[PDB]
DNA sequence: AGTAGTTATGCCGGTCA
DNA sequence: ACTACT
RNA sequence: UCGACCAGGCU
């Protein structure tokens, strides 16, 4: 799953900054621009790689105002969750529709029926938490899940998984 | 595709600057002088935007770049510092 | 040999009047009405029907005729005419716009 | 401008791809269904009924209302709503294509009348230029009447082969109005072709056989000539014209739609009526006349759809066509801020090059200035002196955009600058302009000179600059504009100026002389006769700004 | 102020055709094992198992705190905190996800060598198996071949299951250990 | 009609003159490459004159006591007479300038002489004279080398076109073609040391300046030449305030329509 | 070559063009009676190796249809046999720069 | 006053680019469009204050730009739309040449 | 024939919904 | 008032 | 906020 991908990304810079450590405040806003950030057609960028290479290439000056802009070319890590895909996790929350895994950046959520029957939900717990003949979710428990469903949603992704499957489950 | 960047060496360009090149120059360089950009000479008491960039184009300190487009889409890079002044 | 003698007759018009225009142009004017093939006339009828963008050609005679036919036959404009960037409001590639201008990052250094 | 920070990346436009719209795309873009053809007043309640304009378009009402997208009036651009139309209709500006499509396509079956089977036609078919080749194509099987099922192959014209089908005769076409009318030809059989006719043809017409035909079948398809969901306009393209209140002030164009708006509901309701079959296309070529006249109006079928009074009602195409026109009246050029102009008179006073302008001007065109530790003193002195003092400024706008009015601002002589804001002040002393005689004829009727302000109401120029412009002093007006940017006049003072335009290229020699007094004059201070004493010698040495005080 | 991905395919206007993702190896066209390098050149698809990733990320956060004192000039629940450092030293603190990443990372990482690592890409890139296949198979603890081919049902018939147990085997054993 | 013809007709960065769609339509601006506010009317000498007083100008014969260049004005008068190394270099140089006589003869067989051309070299010498004072009564310093083998190495240096191949090279050579002919027609060894009296250093000026000069009156590419083209005839048509054959405006007019059915449809046969 | 007298056949000609490669010229006599080629005002054209015009196509960064054009039917193009895509370079003096160099190319 | 036909001309000849998009834009009209990257429409619904663009139809939410053109410019866009003609704008070529 | 398309630049009273 | 094209 | 159409006059 989580990728290495090579991407680029425009930026303007006013001609204030058109001094001699430029390299370095393009090469950070950079930074402050991508890693963090998400789309649904990268997914998660996580870290940008190599700082140290990081292709400026030749800016071109604006016309009206004198700003430049340069086609930062740049590589880096991503995570990009899919649909079928298996994931195991932390849990984080949980209620009597289902509980939230983290996956990594991400968050992914089980819904209720989307569990094994016989699995229960146990509300008067503290934390919270879903009992079966033999398990015990909850709160803190890793768990193996497959990745149902995906939305892609402002800055981040969501997706809804099953542990109704073989081998999925708490582990 | 850069495989329209004609190497440094191979350029048949004018070696000369043109005044429409020039003009332009003066130009932006002004404009970013006056947008408070960093200048490269000295002010030798100089306080206008436009002085200070033929200044800085007399003393060959103008940290800018003319690419020059061919009819295909082919161009050459120019510095000012390399292109001539005869004008 | 029509080249030649479009612009021997153009020149006679100008200096009948004893008037003195430098060859170059009526040199270019003569050229353009003879390089596609015969005479193209600087008429709405010759020159404004050439390959030139839709845009460009409607700036002249048949405006709406021509931006219809546009449509239909679904033209593309280089928006390398001097007219549809003027009506963009972009900057034509002319004089000041034959060439771009970047900041070079390397001699910004050696300088200080 | 058009202001307010939008985080979409900006761009210049590269291409233009012209086509033709489907109506599928038409109700994909609209915001709005539109079927009431009132402007609002929903039930004489001013505001906007769900029908016309706004049932979700642009707005009026200085309201930032307009489904969520607010902003407000300026930057608010349009926004397209439709019209499901009650029967396809032409498209005024197509029919004569329409027409010349179906003269090289079968009806009935729709496919091209000449194959590669026929050599001629090959021949075409090569022909790489859609406008050319659709050219020949048509010339060449237009008149080929008859959807031949079987033709002679390149062996022998013996054993002919097989095609498509249907060798249904072809009628021959001719216009009438904006209706087209065949006759399959003893004697002919006349009978009006349909458009629901026509569209489904077209609509049949192979991919291929599109393109051979100059189409393109993701941009411009044929069918697509025939209207048939039809795009309307929002606000901005027929804004109103209120005069206050309770009046109104709609737009030609408003009033069309509501033409073609109602001409719709009347048809649709009589095939969901009594249909006296043939009394409803009575009222069908209403919507086609109405749907035409929209577009264009000044067509050869001389019904010129005036409006109630008699006035015409100005066609969409009306418009855009030349001089005055969208293009060349809005585009090719157009009115201006910071221009001035006044009569003009010489003065043997001013440099080739000067340009002498009445101080009442100098104080109303102003120049963009930003706030640098070079000037932050300078323009201090001019915002503190005023708009009305000369050498000056008339606004102060700060890096959060907004107009300080030096004017009534309770704080104008307050105010202390911010590198990086910008001052507005007086056009001063040697700030280069562009100063311009119409007709502007080459060059040189446009040139770039040096400001100098001064008393008196006129434009005051060098004799010398006399002949480049034109100008006389009978009365002639002179323009002047002047730039904005930094570069702006960089362009104008290295590319344009007076002195540079002095040597001209139109016939490789100078375009300025010495003129009236001074060249009358001149000859008679040169003649052997002419002696000069002392005294005056001495003022005439004086007089030349050079002299290098050497008797 | 976007960010652009090494190919440009035509906007033909007719948007419309992109399926859905799956577990039949269909991630978007921007993830296919045919795909551009910066130099413009073919190269296949960079999938990470994790722990190669928290591998990947370290260090360069690491050669970036470095170069971000050039110019300076003029044990699993132990690493939580050397990492949470580094973090906050070349990181942009809002970054909760390369944070969450971190830890997520840390914990559930399978090998913590720079060699173990190795040797579970030699092992596993000689199978001819899909990238993404390599990168779950190596992040994903897997007994049988049935566990493996039944949360990775890319497999199935690309691998028989001998042989797919046998590198899960070896998976286990390259285990680092905790 | 004019102007909307030509707008987007400029010489582009190869000085090649095209239009928005990248077609040639004149390969050199001008056929010659220079911008026209640098051309001047220049005499052509070598076209006119007799063969009588041609060769009484340009001819040196060092081997002859009648016709070499009299010590007086070369200093390596005397010493020169009789090389027969050197009437190589005078006898090809003579060679060639009667060669130009007859192309010239050739392209303006009207016969006449003077034409725009671009660096104005009658000034640019004679300020290479008062600059240096040059006494004619002294003699020169030059070798009859030093001028042949100095205005042949100049020429070199008169570039329009640049590019390293033949077929560039090639129409480089065309484009300077008549301006060499006024070159060689003014910078002869007999007219050199002659008529001019130049000095080795006042020579060396003149070769400098006529090539700068030159590279200055070059088009610069980015010149909107159409529109200029345009307006330079349009212009001048305007003040038309109009051999009986229609001629001015309505002729003018005629033509750019390529009006068929011309009135006046005269036909000159010799 | 065929120098017919007052024309031939609407069905002779009908021939001509069926026997390739090898082609066939129809020209009319009183049509070659003077030689245009030697008129005053008409320049020296030149055929083109298919490399002499690769190579003006290569030197001058042109595709084919940016090239100046010449009718087949043009009188000196006949003259020289031209045939669509063949390129002539046309060569004439110049009251600017001596002797100048065009090109055009067959339509 | 009116900067026409003929002056625009004027400055083409002078080669002074800048100065005459100047003209025709800061010193006139000028407004700001944002266009979709699929049909080069003006389509787009753009919120420039919760950051929401989108083009329903072509349902894009990421692809969008925005450019500046004299507003007379826009109209004419509309009115050729009015008129069923589809005048797309693209900020990238594709004809290449 | 029939069929349309133009025509210089720019600036400065009086009826109609 | 004139001019070319379908 | 602010338009259309017509007609008339100056260069
Ligand atoms: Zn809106
Ligand atoms: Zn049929
Ligand atoms: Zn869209």
Redesign the pocket.
């Known amino acids: 799953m989580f990728f290495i991908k090579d991407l680029s990304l425009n930026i303007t810079l006013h001609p204030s900054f058109f001094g001699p450590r430029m390299k370095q405040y393009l090469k950070t806003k950079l930074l402050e621009e991508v890693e963090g950030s998400c789309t649904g057609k990268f997914g998660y960028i996580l870290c940008v790689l190599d700082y140290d290479n990081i292709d400026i290439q030749r800016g071109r000056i604006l016309p009206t105002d004198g700003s430049a802009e340069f086609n930062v070319k740049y590589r880096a890590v991503v995570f990009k969750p899919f649909k079928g895909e298996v994931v195991d996790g932390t849990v984080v929350s949980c209620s009597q529709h289902g509980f939230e895994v983290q996956v990594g950046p991400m968050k992914v959520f089980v819904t209720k029926h989307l569990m094994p029957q016989d699995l229960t939900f146990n509300a008067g717990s503290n934390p919270p938490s879903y009992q079966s003949s033999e398990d015990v979710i909850t709160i803190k428990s890793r768990i193996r899940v497959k990745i149902e469903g995906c939305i892609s949603q402002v800055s981040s992704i969501h997706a809804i998984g099953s542990i109704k499957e073989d081998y999925l489950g708490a582990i | 595709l850069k495989e329209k960047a004609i190497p440094k060496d191979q350029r048949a360009t004018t070696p000369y600057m043109t005044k429409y090149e020039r003009a332009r120059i003066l130009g932006t360089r002004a404009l970013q002088i006056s947008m408070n950009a960093p200048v490269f000479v000295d002010l030798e008491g100089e306080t206008d935007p436009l002085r200070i960039a033929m200044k800085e184009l007399a003393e060959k300190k103008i940290p800018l770049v003319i690419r020059r487009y061919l009819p295909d889409g082919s161009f050459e890079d120019w510095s000012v510092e390399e292109l001539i002044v005869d004008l | 040999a029509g080249r030649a003698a479009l612009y021997k007759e153009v020149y006679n018009v100008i200096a009948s009047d004893g008037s003195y225009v430098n060859y170059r142009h009526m040199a270019l004017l003569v050229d353009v009405m003879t390089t596609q093939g015969g005479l193209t006339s600087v008429t709405?009828?010759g020159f404004n029907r050439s390959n030139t963008g839709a845009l460009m050609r409607c700036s002249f005679?048949?405006?709406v005729?021509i931006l219809f036919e546009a449509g239909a036959s679904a033209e593309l404009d280089d928006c390398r005419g001097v007219s549809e960037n003027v009506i963009l409001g972009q900057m034509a590639p002319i004089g000041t716009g034959a060439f771009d201008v970047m900041i070079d990052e390397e001699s910004l250094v050696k300088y200080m | 401008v058009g202001q307010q920070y939008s985080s979409a990346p900006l761009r210049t436009v590269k291409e233009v791809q012209f086509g033709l719209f489907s109506p599928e795309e038409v109700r994909a873009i609209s915001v709005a269904k539109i079927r009431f053809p009132e402007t609002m007043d929903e039930t004489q309640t001013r505001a906007k009924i769900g029908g016309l304009n706004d049932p979700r378009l642009g707005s009026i009402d200085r309201n930032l209302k307009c489904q969520t997208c607010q902003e407000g009036m300026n930057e608010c651009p349009g926004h397209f709503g439709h019209i499901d139309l009650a029967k396809p209709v032409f498209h005024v500006g197509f029919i004569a294509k329409i027409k010349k499509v179906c003269e090289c396509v079968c009806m009935h079956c729709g496919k091209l009348l000449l194959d590669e089977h026929n050599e001629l036609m090959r021949q075409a078919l090569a022909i790489k230029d859609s406008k050319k080749r659709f050219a020949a194509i048509w010339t060449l099987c237009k008149t080929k009447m008859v959807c031949e099922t079987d033709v002679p192959s390149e062996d022998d014209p013996t054993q002919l082969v097989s095609r498509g089908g249907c060798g249904n005769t072809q009628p021959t076409i001719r216009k009438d109005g904006l209706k087209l009318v065949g006759s399959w030809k003893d004697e002919p059989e006349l009978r009006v072709l349909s458009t629901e006719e026509i569209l489904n043809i077209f609509k049949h017409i192979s991919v291929k056989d599109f393109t051979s035909l100059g189409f393109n079948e993701v941009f411009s398809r044929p069918e697509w000539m025939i209207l048939t969901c039809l795009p309307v306009p929002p606000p901005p393209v027929r804004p109103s014209?209120?005069?206050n209140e309770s009046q109104?002030?709609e737009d030609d164009l408003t009033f069309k739609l509501a033409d073609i708006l109602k001409a719709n509901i009347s048809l649709e309701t009589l095939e969901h009526n009594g249909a006296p079959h043939h009394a409803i296309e009575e009222a069908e070529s209403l919507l086609q006349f109405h749907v035409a006249t929209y577009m264009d109006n000044d067509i050869?079928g001389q019904p010129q759809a005036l409006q109630?009074?008699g006035?015409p009602v100005?066609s969409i195409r009306a418009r855009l066509?030349?001089?005055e026109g969208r293009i060349r009246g809005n585009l090719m050029?157009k009115?201006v801020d910071f221009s001035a102009?006044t009569v003009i008179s010489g003065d043997p006073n001013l440099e080739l090059d000067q340009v002498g302008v009445p101080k009442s001007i100098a104080k109303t065109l102003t120049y963009p200035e930003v706030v640098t530790p070079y000037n932050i003193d300078r323009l201090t002195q001019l915002v503190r002196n005023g708009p009305n003092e000369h050498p000056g400024a008339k606004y102060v706008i700060r890096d959060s955009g907004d107009r300080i009015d030096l004017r009534y601002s309770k704080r104008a002589g307050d105010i202390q600058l911010q590198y990086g804001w910008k001052v507005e002040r007086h056009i001063m002393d040697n700030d280069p302009v562009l100063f311009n005689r119409?007709?502007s004829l080459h060059k040189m009727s446009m040139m770039a000179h040096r400001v100098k302000v001064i008393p008196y109401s006129t434009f005051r120029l060098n004799l010398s600059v006399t002949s480049p412009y034109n100008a006389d002093f009978?009365?002639?007006?002179m323009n002047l504009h002047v730039p904005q940017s930094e570069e702006t006049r960089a362009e104008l003072s290295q590319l344009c100026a007076v002195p540079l335009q002095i040597v001209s290229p139109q016939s490789n020699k100078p375009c300025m002389g010495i003129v009236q007094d001074t060249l009358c004059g001149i000859r008679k201070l040169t003649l052997r006769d002419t002696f000069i004493e002392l005294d005056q010698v001495l003022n005439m040495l004086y007089w030349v700004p050079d002299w290098d005080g050497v008797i | 102020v976007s960010t652009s991905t090494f190919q440009t395919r035509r906007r033909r206007l007719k948007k419309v055709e992109e399926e859905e993702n799956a577990a039949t190896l269909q991630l978007g066209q921007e993830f296919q094992l045919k795909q551009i390098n910066h130099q413009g050149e073919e190269e296949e698809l960079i999938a990470l198992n994790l722990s190669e990733a928290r591998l990947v990320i370290k260090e360069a956060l690491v050669e970036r705190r470095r170069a971000f004192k050039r110019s300076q000039k003029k044990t699993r629940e132990k690493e939580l905190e050397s990492i949470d450092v580094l973090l906050e030293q070349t990181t942009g603190g809002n970054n909760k996800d390369l944070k969450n990443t971190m830890q997520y990372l840390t914990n559930f990482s399978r090998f913590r060598d720079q060699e173990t690592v190795g040797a579970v890409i030699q092992l596993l890139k000689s199978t001819g198996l899909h990238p993404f296949e390599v990168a779950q198979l190596g992040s994903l603890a897997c007994d049988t071949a049935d566990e493996a081919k039944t949360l990775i049902p890319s497999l199935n018939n690309k691998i028989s299951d001998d042989e797919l147990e046998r590198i899960l085997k070896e998976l286990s054993n390259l285990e680092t250990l905790y | 009609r004019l102007v909307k013809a030509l707008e987007d007709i400029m010489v582009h960065y190869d000085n090649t003159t095209r239009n928005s769609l990248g077609n040639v339509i004149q390969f050199i601006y001008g056929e010659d490459g220079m911008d026209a506010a640098h051309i001047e009317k220049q005499s052509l000498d070598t076209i006119g004159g007799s063969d009588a007083a041609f060769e009484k100008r340009y001819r040196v014969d060092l081997l002859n006591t009648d016709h070499t260049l009299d010590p007086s004005l070369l200093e390596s008068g005397s010493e020169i007479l009789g090389d027969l190394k050197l009437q190589v270099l005078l006898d090809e140089e003579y060679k060639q300038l009667v060669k130009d006589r007859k192309f010239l003869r050739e392209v303006f067989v009207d016969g006449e002489a003077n034409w725009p051309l671009p660096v104005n070299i009658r000034r640019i010498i004679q300020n290479a004279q008062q600059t240096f004072h040059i006494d004619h009564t002294k003699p020169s310093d030059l070798t009859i080398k030093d001028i042949v083998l100095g205005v042949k190495d100049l020429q070199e240096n008169l570039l329009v076109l640049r590019g390293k191949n033949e077929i560039i090279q090639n129409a480089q050579r065309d484009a300077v073609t008549l301006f060499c002919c006024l070159l060689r027609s003014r910078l002869a060894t007999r007219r050199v040391l002659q008529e001019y009296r130049l000095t080795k250093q006042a020579f060396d000026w003149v070769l400098s300046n006529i090539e700068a000069q030159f590279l200055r009156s070059v088009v610069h590419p980015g010149e909107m030449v159409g529109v200029l083209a345009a307006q330079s005839i349009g212009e001048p048509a305007t003040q038309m305030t109009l051999k009986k054959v229609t001629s001015g405006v309505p002729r003018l007019k005629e033509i750019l329509?390529v009006?068929?059915?011309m009135k006046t449809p005269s036909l000159t046969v010799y | 070559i065929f120098v017919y007298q007052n024309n031939i056949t609407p069905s002779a000609m009908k021939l001509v063009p069926s026997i390739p490669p090898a082609t066939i010229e129809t020209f009319n006599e009183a049509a070659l009676v003077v030689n245009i080629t030697h008129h005053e005002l008409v320049p020296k054209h030149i055929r083109l190796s298919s490399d002499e015009k690769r190579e003006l196509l290569k030197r001058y960064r042109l595709k084919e249809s940016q090239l100046p054009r010449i009718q087949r039917a043009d009188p000196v193009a006949l003259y020289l046999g031209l045939k669509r895509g063949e390129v002539v370079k046309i060569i004439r003096k110049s009251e600017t720069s001596g002797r100048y160099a065009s090109y055009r190319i067959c339509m | 006053?009116?900067f026409?036909?003929?002056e625009r001309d004027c400055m083409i000849a002078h080669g002074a680019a800048s100065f005459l998009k100047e003209r025709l834009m800061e010193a006139s009209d000028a407004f700001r469009v944002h266009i979709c990257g699929i049909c080069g429409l003006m389509t787009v619904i753009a919120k420039l204050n919760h950051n929401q663009f989108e083009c329903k139809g072509c349902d894009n939410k990421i692809d969008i730009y925005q450019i500046h053109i004299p507003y007379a410019a826009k109209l004419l866009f509309q009115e050729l739309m009015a008129m069923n003609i589809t005048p797309r704008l693209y900020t990238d070529r594709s004809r290449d040449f």
């Open positions: 709405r009828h005679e048949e405006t005729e | 014209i209120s005069f109104r002030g050869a109630k009074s006035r100005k066509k030349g001089k050029g009115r102009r119409q007709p009978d009365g002639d007006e | 329509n009006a068929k059915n | 006053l009116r026409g036909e003929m």
